Write a protein that holds these residues in place. Structure first.
Motif, short mmCIF file in Angstrom:
data_model
loop_
_atom_site.label_atom_id
_atom_site.label_comp_id
_atom_site.label_asym_id
_atom_site.label_seq_id
_atom_site.Cartn_x
_atom_site.Cartn_y
_atom_site.Cartn_z
N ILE A 253 0.83 -1.20 0.00
CA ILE A 253 0.00 0.00 0.00
C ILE A 253 0.87 1.25 0.00
CG2 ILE A 253 -1.67 1.36 1.32
CD1 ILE A 253 -2.72 -1.40 2.38
N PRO A 284 -2.49 -12.69 -3.71
CA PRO A 284 -2.86 -11.78 -4.79
C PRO A 284 -1.74 -10.80 -5.13
CG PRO A 284 -4.68 -11.97 -3.24
CD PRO A 284 -3.53 -12.75 -2.66
N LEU A 289 -4.26 -4.71 -6.14
CA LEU A 289 -4.62 -3.70 -5.15
C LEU A 289 -4.50 -2.27 -5.69
CD1 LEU A 289 -3.37 -4.96 -1.66
CD2 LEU A 289 -5.51 -5.37 -2.88
N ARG A 291 -5.52 0.91 -7.74
CA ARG A 291 -6.61 1.62 -8.39
C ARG A 291 -6.10 2.67 -9.38
NH1 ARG A 291 -10.06 0.00 -3.36
NH2 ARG A 291 -9.20 1.21 -1.61
N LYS B 24 -10.24 -9.73 5.21
CA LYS B 24 -9.50 -8.76 4.41
C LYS B 24 -10.38 -7.58 4.06
CE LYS B 24 -6.23 -11.79 1.96
NZ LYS B 24 -5.78 -12.23 0.61
N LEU B 28 -9.65 -3.83 5.37
CA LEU B 28 -9.28 -2.85 4.35
C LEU B 28 -10.26 -1.68 4.31
CD1 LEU B 28 -6.74 -3.50 2.77
CD2 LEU B 28 -8.14 -4.02 0.77
N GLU B 65 0.06 -12.77 4.60
CA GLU B 65 -0.11 -11.60 3.75
C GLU B 65 0.05 -10.30 4.53
OE1 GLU B 65 -3.21 -11.50 0.85
OE2 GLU B 65 -3.43 -13.69 0.78
N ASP B 82 -2.05 1.96 6.01
CA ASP B 82 -2.33 3.30 5.50
C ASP B 82 -3.58 3.27 4.62
OD1 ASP B 82 -0.01 4.03 6.76
OD2 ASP B 82 0.91 4.96 5.00
N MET B 83 -4.37 4.34 4.66
CA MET B 83 -5.47 4.47 3.71
C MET B 83 -4.88 4.63 2.32
SD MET B 83 -6.61 5.37 6.78
CE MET B 83 -5.59 6.84 6.76
N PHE B 84 -5.60 4.16 1.31
CA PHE B 84 -5.23 4.43 -0.07
C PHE B 84 -5.47 5.91 -0.36
CE2 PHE B 84 -4.58 0.21 -1.85
CZ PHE B 84 -5.26 -0.61 -0.97
N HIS B 89 -9.09 8.52 -9.31
CA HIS B 89 -8.99 7.23 -9.98
C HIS B 89 -9.16 7.39 -11.49
CE1 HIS B 89 -8.55 5.38 -6.24
NE2 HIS B 89 -9.65 4.66 -6.15
N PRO B 90 -8.26 6.77 -12.27
CA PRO B 90 -8.44 6.72 -13.72
C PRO B 90 -9.58 5.78 -14.09
CG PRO B 90 -6.14 6.33 -13.09
CD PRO B 90 -6.96 6.22 -11.85
#
Ligand SMILES: [Zn+2]
Ligand SMILES: [Zn+2]
Lengths: 463, 468
Positions: A253, A284, A289, A291, B24, B28, B65, B82-84, B89-90
């Motif tokens: 991430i 995976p 993951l 985007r 997960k 997430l 994982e 961490d947050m994305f 976003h494309p």
């Protein structure tokens, strides 16, 4: 003119061939002067006591190649040619593998491949549409094959993409070269230290700036990436090569966010052994993951099958694909029959059966290997790396240099490699312990014990 | 703390997979906060009415994982992630790239010079050869073939081209393979980085594009009656020539032995001069025997020989080879990072195919087939055109050239032909730089040998109007 003595049994060479060859040697050696008329077809025919058709064939050969020229109101005349103005080391030698034991991380398993079913899938692929075997050479590869691979990796790696984004193939090297050509020319690459050195060499040979980046326990260092501020990353998230550490989701991430922060940042994911994880399910891919479309997913069938086949693929973000379609001159490096055979192997379910079987087999082999190592070395060996893939790392307690061990093992007909070959930039920093990479891929279980017995001296001289 | 619904049906995923997927998902999405404890194996197992083994598999997955971590106690905690972004976003799709459109072609008759005949090939004897090759070797193929290709294969090809092309080398000089493009790339990396390249104008435009892409200086050499001009080569002083001596692409001119002497001497008159000989269709010569390769006349080791089977053999099969001068061999051996691009089984099958004599047999059969088909396509051409047809090129190889007496531009005739179901290529394509074209006649390149020959009449008839 000197004389033409020809073997009439031919076979050897045909009469006309012997003739025009002699004529070539004679025009070249100057024994036949330029602008000198040669005997007419019928004349030389009579001299040589051969068919006129033969002399005519020879003369037509000369005429076509420009040794002779023709004059309406004949005969034929010697053309005017200018005179020519004015190993050991190279020469490889052959020494057989018998009997060497190989801990090499390269090569692969032979005895376990479903070669018969592979040939079945080959016959099937060929016969399926045979007229269509010369129909499709698409530079990215045959659409049906790209589709089958897209679907397969959708299941296995969680990779998302259309077949339009995929490019086969024939090794990760050619695809990587192509990729360096599609990416910015001034792009600053960064690789894992230690890492895959063929890739480093390929990147340095293009005169690319490649910054080296250390691993922490979590793999590729995000702090050192942040500090050295490169453009594209080259990483092995599933099983790190050589080290063997799985990149945790937190670091993944972190990388993805790093690539999303700025425009024109990329991550090359090199996925090689990921289909083999012995404790758990296959993890995976990083790509799954993402985007942001900053990750170019590279994958290979090379560990999966593969004597000595070499099929690979890469999935590109749209920008790079568009940069790819504007070249125009690329050609597909994989045989169409190979692609179609692969499609048949995948869609008939034989591939996944193969992967399952080899997964179990490799699990057992790594277990027996580790058992033999712990038996022989006890607590003086340390095994590094995840339980997965075809290789792990081994450190030993001794002051004997890696070189000593490598040479002594070479004298023992044992094939191993030290970790120092995976250093992109040399570091000492500091001393031992010495370390080896141990592949079990092509190794026989029956050869395991002796192998481990051929190890251990060295690592220790003679014991 | 748990809410999870299980699908226990046969068609669903294994329970442990469902458990770790759900976990997960909720980790997430922050539904499970970082460092919050996760139920013990037994507790979570009993609460879901499911085996403790499944729970243990799911937890092992999450730990491996890195969604969970362990302090030794219980002791299983959600890992801090961490947050994305938080960035834009494309999208998906993108119609210009999304366009790969599939429509079945034939017919669609093809005059294309590009490969190949799919039929007519002894795929039965090829499969046979592959079988006895696989029975002879294996276990070999698992041992990671020599980067130049397997030695015995290179030896077979060595003898083969000694007999057929008159080429003299040792197997250590040969590099396979998988197309002339990878070999040319490698070659540009072996030759000096500042090397000045010269190509035939018109010529193979793909090589031109590869060279220009690599940032090499590339000079275009004008052609004359004898092929590549020694005069122009003398004027612009290139370091390395790229030539097609046997059958010149596109124009079809065969280079006479005199021009060959000129080029070879030019190569020998100064140090570090090179000649890349691109040999593709040479094995098809209808009037005469195949002319010996240019490199066979070289006493000075200045010629790199580029061979390929991509004409004769399967359309699918990509196998090429190159013969390097020893200095370039040294340079290549300094690299150490190269891997062989051709499959070992394909190589061994090639060796078996050559050494069983099946290859040259095939060569002869295809040579006759092409001789006839070309003769007939020419006859039909001179039939449906009295006429304004002008045929150019030697009698050899898989293609020739056609000049026409007409008004219309080449682009016109091409578009027309496209709307006519005729696949055909112009000569303007093979021109390198190239300004705007030529005008004049204009002319087309006619490839055959991919042509099913039932189309010859209707194909030429389609080549009538347009042209005209
Ligand atoms: Zn981006
Ligand atoms: Zn020289």
């Amino acid at each position: 003119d000197i004389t033409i003595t020809l073997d009439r049994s031919e076979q050897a060479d045909y009469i006309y061939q012997q003739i025009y060859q002699k004529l070539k040697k004679e025009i070249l050696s100057r024994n036949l002067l330029p602008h000198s008329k040669v005997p007419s077809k019928r004349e030389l025919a009579e001299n040589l006591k051969v068919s006129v058709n033969s002399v005519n064939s020879a003369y037509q050969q000369l005429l076509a190649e420009g040794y002779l020229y023709a004059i309406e109101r004949k005969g034929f005349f010697v053309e005017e040619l200018d005179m020519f103005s004015a190993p050991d080391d190279l020469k490889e030698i052959h020494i057989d593998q018998s009997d060497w034991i190989s801990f090499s991380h390269m090569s692969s398993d032979t005895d376990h491949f479903p070669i018969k079913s592979w040939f079945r899938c080959e016959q099937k692929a060929a016969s399926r549409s045979y007229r269509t075997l010369g129909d499709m050479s698409h530079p990215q590869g045959i659409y049906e094959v790209r589709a089958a691979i897209t679907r397969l990796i959708s299941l296995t790696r969680g990779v998302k993409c259309r077949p339009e984004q995929m490019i086969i193939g024939a090794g990760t090297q050619v695809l990587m070269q192509l990729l360096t050509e599609l990416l910015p020319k001034e792009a600053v690459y960064a690789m894992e230290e230690p890492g895959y050195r063929r890739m480093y060499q390929l990147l340095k040979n293009a005169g690319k700036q490649v910054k080296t980046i250390m691993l922490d326990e979590k793999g590729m260092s995000i702090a050192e990436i942040t500090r050295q501020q490169p453009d594209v990353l080259v990483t092995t998230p599933s099983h790190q090569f050589p080290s063997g550490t799985i990149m945790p989701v937190s670091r993944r991430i972190q990388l993805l966010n790093w690539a999303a922060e700025e425009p024109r940042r990329y991550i090359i994911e090199d996925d090689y052994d990921s289909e083999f994880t012995y404790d758990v399910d296959s993890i995976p891919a990083l790509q799954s993951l993402d985007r942001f479309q900053n990750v170019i997913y590279m994958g290979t069938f090379s560990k999966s099958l593969l004597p000595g086949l070499r099929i690979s693929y890469m999935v590109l973000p749209p920008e790079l694909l568009r940069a790819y379609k504007q070249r125009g001159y690329d050609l597909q490096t994989c045989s169409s029959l190979t692609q179609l055979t692969l499609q048949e192997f995948i869609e008939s379910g034989e591939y996944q059966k193969h992967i399952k079987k080899m997964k179990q087999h490799y699990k057992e082999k790594r277990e027996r290997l580790i058992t033999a190592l712990e038996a022989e070395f006890s607590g003086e060996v340390t095994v590094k790396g995840a339980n997965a893939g075809l290789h792990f790392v081994t450190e030993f307690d001794t002051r004997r240099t890696e070189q000593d061990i490598l040479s002594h093992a070479a004298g023992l007909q044992l094939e191993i490699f030290g970790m120092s070959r995976f250093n992109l930039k040399e570091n000492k920093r500091q001393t031992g312990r010495p370390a080896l990479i141990i592949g079990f891929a092509r190794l026989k279980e029956e050869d395991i014990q002796e192998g481990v017995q051929r190890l251990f001296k060295a690592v220790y001289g003679h014991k």
